[PDB]
């Protein structure tokens, strides 16, 4: 497992503990739910590149405490 920090446009953070092999759709959906907006209204970036629903932390090279940025789609 690793902890990822999801940083919003307003500088707020929600952190997620996920498995290295987990498809990140679940993280996207949980974050959008907590922001009260549709998942498709947001885009989630790692090092500026879009995280797909079927990407895993392992595939993206993510490490403990790495940042995911959320932007409006």
């Amino acid at each position: 497992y690793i902890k990822l920090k999801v940083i919003g446009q307003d500088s707020s953070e929600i952190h997620f503990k996920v498995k290295m092999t987990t498809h990140l759709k679940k993280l996207k959906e949980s974050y959008a739910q907590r922001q009260g907006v549709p998942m498709n209204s947001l885009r989630f970036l790692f090092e500026g590149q879009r995280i797909a629903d079927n990407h895993t932390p392992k595939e993206l090279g993510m490490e403990e405490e790495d940042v995911i940025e959320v932007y409006q789609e």
């Binding site: 902890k3 707020s12 953070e13 929600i14 952190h15 997620f16 503990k17 996920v18 498995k19 987990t22 679940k26 993280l27 949980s30 907590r34």
Partner: peptide, 10 residues
Amino acid sequence: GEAEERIISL
């Protein structure tokens, strides 16, 4: 003010 820490397990 200052937000508390939020960690969600999936």
